[PDB]
Amino acid sequence: DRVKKLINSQISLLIGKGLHEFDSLRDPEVNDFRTKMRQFCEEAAAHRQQLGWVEWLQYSFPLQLEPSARGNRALLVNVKFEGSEESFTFQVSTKDMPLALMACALRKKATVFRQPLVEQPEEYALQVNGRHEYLYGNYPLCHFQYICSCLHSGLTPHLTMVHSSSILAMRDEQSNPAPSLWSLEQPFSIELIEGRKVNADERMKLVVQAGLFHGNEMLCKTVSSSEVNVCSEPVWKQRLEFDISVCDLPRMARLCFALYAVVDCPIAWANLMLFDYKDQLKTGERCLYMWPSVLLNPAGTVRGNPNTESAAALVIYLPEVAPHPVYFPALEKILELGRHGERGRITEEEQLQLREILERGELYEHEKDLVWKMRHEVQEHFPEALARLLLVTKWNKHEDVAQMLYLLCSWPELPVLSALELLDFSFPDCYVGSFAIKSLRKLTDDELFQYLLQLVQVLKYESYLDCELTKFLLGRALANRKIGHFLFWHLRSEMHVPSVALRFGLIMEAYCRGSTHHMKVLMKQGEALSKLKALNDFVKVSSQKTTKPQTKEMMHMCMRQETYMEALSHLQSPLDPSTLLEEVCVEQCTFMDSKMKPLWIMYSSEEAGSAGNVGIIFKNGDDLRQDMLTLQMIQLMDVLWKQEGLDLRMTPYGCLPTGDRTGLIEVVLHSDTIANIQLNKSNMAATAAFNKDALLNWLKSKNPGEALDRAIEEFTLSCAGYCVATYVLGIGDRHSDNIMIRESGQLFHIDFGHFLGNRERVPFILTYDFVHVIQQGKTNNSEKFERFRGYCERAYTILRRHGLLFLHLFALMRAAGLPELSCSKDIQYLKDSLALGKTEEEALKHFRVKFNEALRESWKTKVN
Numbered sequence: 001d002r003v004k005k006l007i008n009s010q011i012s013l014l015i016g017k018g019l020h021e022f023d024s025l026r027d028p029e030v031n032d033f034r035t036k037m038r039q040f041c042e043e044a045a046a047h048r049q050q051l052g053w054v055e056w057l058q059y060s061f062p063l064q065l066e067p068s069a070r071g072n073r074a075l076l077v078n079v080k081f082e083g084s085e086e087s088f089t090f091q092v093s094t095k096d097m098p099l100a101l102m103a104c105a106l107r108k109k110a111t112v113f114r115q116p117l118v119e120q121p122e123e124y125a126l127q128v129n130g131r132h133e134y135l136y137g138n139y140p141l142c143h144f145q146y147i148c149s150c151l152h153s154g155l156t157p158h159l160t161m162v163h164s165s166s167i168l169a170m171r172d173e174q175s176n177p178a179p180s181l182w183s184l185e186q187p188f189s190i191e192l193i194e195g196r197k198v199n200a201d202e203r204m205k206l207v208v209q210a211g212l213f214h215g216n217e218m219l220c221k222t223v224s225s226s227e228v229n230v231c232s233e234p235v236w237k238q239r240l241e242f243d244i245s246v247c248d249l250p251r252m253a254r255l256c257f258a259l260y261a262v263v264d265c266p267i268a269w270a271n272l273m274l275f276d277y278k279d280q281l282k283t284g285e286r287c288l289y290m291w292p293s294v295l296l297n298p299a300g301t302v303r304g305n306p307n308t309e310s311a312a313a314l315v316i317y318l319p320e321v322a323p324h325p326v327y328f329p330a331l332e333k334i335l336e337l338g339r340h341g342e343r344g345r346i347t348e349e350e351q352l353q354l355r356e357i358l359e360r361g362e363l364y365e366h367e368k369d370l371v372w373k374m375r376h377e378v379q380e381h382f383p384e385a386l387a388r389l390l391l392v393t394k395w396n397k398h399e400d401v402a403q404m405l406y407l408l409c410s411w412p413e414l415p416v417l418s419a420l421e422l423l424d425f426s427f428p429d430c431y432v433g434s435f436a437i438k439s440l441r442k443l444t445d446d447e448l449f450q451y452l453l454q455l456v457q458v459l460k461y462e463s464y465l466d467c468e469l470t471k472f473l474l475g476r477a478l479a480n481r482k483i484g485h486f487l488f489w490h491l492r493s494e495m496h497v498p499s500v501a502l503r504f505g506l507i508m509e510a511y512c513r514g515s516t517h518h519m520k521v522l523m524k525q526g527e528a529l530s531k532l533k534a535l536n537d538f539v540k541v542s543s544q545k546t547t548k549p550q551t552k553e554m555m556h557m558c559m560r561q562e563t564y565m566e567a568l569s570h571l572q573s574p575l576d577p578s579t580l581l582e583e584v585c586v587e588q589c590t591f592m593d594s595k596m597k598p599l600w601i602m603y604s605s606e607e608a609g610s611a612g613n614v615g616i617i618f619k620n621g622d623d624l625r626q627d628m629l630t631l632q633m634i635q636l637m638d639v640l641w642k643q644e645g646l647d648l649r650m651t652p653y654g655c656l657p658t659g660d661r662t663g664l665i666e667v668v669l670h671s672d673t674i675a676n677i678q679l680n681k682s683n684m685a686a687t688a689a690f691n692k693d694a695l696l697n698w699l700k701s702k703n704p705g706e707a708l709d710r711a712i713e714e715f716t717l718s719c720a721g722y723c724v725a726t727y728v729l730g731i732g733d734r735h736s737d738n739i740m741i742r743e744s745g746q747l748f749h750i751d752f753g754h755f756l757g758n759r760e761r762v763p764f765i766l767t768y769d770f771v772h773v774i775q776q777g778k779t780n781n782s783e784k785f786e787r788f789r790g791y792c793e794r795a796y797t798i799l800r801r802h803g804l805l806f807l808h809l810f811a812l813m814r815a816a817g818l819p820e821l822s823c824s825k826d827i828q829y830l831k832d833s834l835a836l837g838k839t840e841e842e843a844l845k846h847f848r849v850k851f852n853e854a855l856r857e858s859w860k861t862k863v864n
């Protein structure tokens with residue numbers, strides 16, 4: 001008590017939902033989750049508080065390595081010892097490991113301080129100055145992202161020697177405070193009693209459409225009520241009998257409802273699991289608080305609408321199918337039934353038919369019959385074809401499900417790629433999901449981080465609160481502070497969505513039990529975001545009444561207040577926990593002229609020097625979820641290309657929704673839009689004789705002498721990357737104001753509100769302004785242009801080879817409820833852009849035709 005009461009009030013404020021609201025529900029599923037997950041997260045907390053000092057560096061500052069390093073050249077480094085003004089600058093090689101650098105700094109200190117030190121290089125770690133980032137382990141310096149960045153930008157790495165006792169003092173201070181169905185052969189049936197708080201046109205009639213689903217797949221035909229006159233409280237009091245026995249209902253069977261008005265006018269929909277969280281087949285009266293429709297929705301949540309006051313409610317009755325409670329058979333009873341079967345002793349000709357269709361993904365009924373018959377052969381010689389076999393399994397026949405389950409329980413572990421496919425709502429079985437998680441345990445923290453966003457969306461397909469995916473995500477989050485950081489923010493940003501608020505709020509509470517210190521760290525971030533919202537509202541009001549210089553001076557005065565200076569300063573960035581947002585640079589803060597007046601907040605850090613000069617963009621009113629997905633997809637391409645030794649110098653900057661139409665974007669400094677550069681302002685070092693000269697002149701002024709060639713090369717590489725990225729993703733609405741260029745020459749895209757050709761197929765784009773720079777400012781430079789076409793081809797063929805990874809990830813994102821990622825049609829776009837139904841030669845020929853057709857469109861600007 002007292003500390004417990006304080007933690008409870010801090011979790012409530014952090015998650016944006018009072019913990020008392022969980023207790024008011026009086027829900028045993030909610031109560032069992034809270035107790036079990038608190039227990040699981042506190043065990044993780046205790047494991048962590050006793051980690052070795054290097055293990056605790058791995059928890060708190062996971063290594064940031066180059067994609068080529070996962071799984072020569074001279075370098076100048078600056079090293080100081082913790083809390084010392086004195087630093088040493090020395091020459092090392094990119095091939096040297098941190099230990100060699102540390103042993104060298106220790107020899108330098110020993111000679112300066114005139115004593116042979118007690119300390120060995122094994123006792124230290126190198127912190128990147130003013131950053132929550134460390135260099136450690138047996139990796140050459142070039143394999144670290146920080147060193148790599150310093151090399152490309154020519155800057156000097158600045159490192160601090162941190163002794164193991166100082167790391168241990170970090171661990172210690174951050175501590176959690178001290179403490180039988182199968183005999184029921186009758187057809188499935190329900191009583192549709194009545195409707196409540198129903199709003200519809202009195203000239204029409206009300207109908208309830210009802211279906212039995214196992215994921216998206218129907219277990220039998222849909223059934224409908226009789227038409228009853230429209231009113232607030234319609235009364236059906238009728239029996240709805242489905243064509244499927246009670247014994248054949250799979251574990252993950254859901255009963256789906258849709259209420260509508262007819263002369264079709266959709267009103268509401270509601271779903272429920274037929275078995276509870278404790279495997280008991282549901283009986284008795286159920287009051288279903290319906291969700292308003294935008295006709296059956298099986299992917300929809302199986303929990304009632306919390307707004308009980310305004311929601312239309314359907315009252316149903318689940319009949320007593322037995323005198324005693326009926327539970328779903330345990331795994332031992334399932335195995336014993338499915339263990340008995342017949343193996344596919346079939347001809348060598350039909351074996352060639354099977355091999356063909358398993359390596360080939362829709363298939364004709366006779367092929368489904370053959371796949372099912374040859375299921376033993378599928379397990380033994382094609383284990384990666386599990387997803388195809390699971391789709392041919394008859395989920396409405398309990399004996400077929402037992403036979404599938406028996407094979408799954410002895411199925412070998414699958415690659416991460418195959419596992420991600422199995423998390424799709426198309427594989428709704430709980431043992432399948434459990435198996436998918438089992439095959440994902442081998443994900444590295446870097447891979448997990450790359451797919452975290454999609455795994456969090458998968459939580460919306462879960463039928464129960466306590467699931468293997470929640471346990472997996474919590475355990476990985478409590479084992480890695482960066483995973484924990486982003487898991488929190490992905491959950492927090494959806495607390496305003498009623499369908500997920502309970503599930504997401506419960507996961508965040510469990511996590512907080514696991515890391516009291518991190519809760520306080522995220523509270524610091526939440527307080528800055530609260531002040532940014534109040535600051536932005538002020539700007540939106542102030543900007544409609546006065547001029548921008550007046551609103552800017554006001555925003556500054558508001559920021560200069562004690563409460564603002566305190567809340568806005570000294571925090572870890574929500575976009576990147578490695579980034580410390582130290583002193584807010586009020587004078588450099590401003591806002592944009594657009595409708596929502598986004599804020600531009602600048603920071604500085606004495607300790608980080610030039611690297612501490614960072615900015616964040618705060619947006620309130622705009623929805624940044626699609627931008628975040630596109631930027632994560634661009635970053636994925638960048639990793640995939642770097643794994644083949646192809647660095648296209650991309651700028652996948654941070655973008656993170658943090659709340660309801662609220663989020664942050666990472667400022668990329670030393671950059672300007674193509675439109676600003678092309679405005680061709682007079683009395684500037686870039687003023688052009690021809691508007692086409694503007695970008696190159698601007699590049700010339702920023703990169704004098706020999707630096708220009710490096711800048712043209714960076715432009716060319718990034719240009720090839722973004723031409724491929726925008727084409728594959730179907731990024732449209734591309735204009736001079738949503739294309740940026742860095743002083744280094746790097747081109748990058750911004751504002752991804754429209755993707756996947758949003759509906760019209762986006763053609764490959766090539767601009768003459770960009771062609772002019774690639775060609776070093778020459779009319780004819782085929783050597784340079786075709787070297788650019790080589791980069792686009794190479795980048796495109798690498799992406800194609802990971803085509804299925806993009807497909808599986810985008811299929812998982814359908815759960816996000818993004819207006820441009822709703823159906824199969826939206827993903828056909830990525831299937832076409834990657835030309836996945838073709839050979840590498842057929843696809844490359846298609847890309848060439850698409851690139852050439854974009855070169856002719858480009859020449860309509862050149863001709864003038």
Ligand SMILES: COc1ncc2cc1NS(=O)(=O)CCN(C)Cc1ccc3c(c1)N2CCO3
Nearest residue numbers: 592598617627653665666667668671750751752
């Ligand atoms: C979806 O919106 C955005 N996406 C990316 C960027 C900015 C915005 N919005 S904005 O701040 O209103 C436009 C700022 N404009 C000066 C151009 C600019 C400059 C630097 C940027 C940037 C936009 N990005 C993120 C990277 O850093």
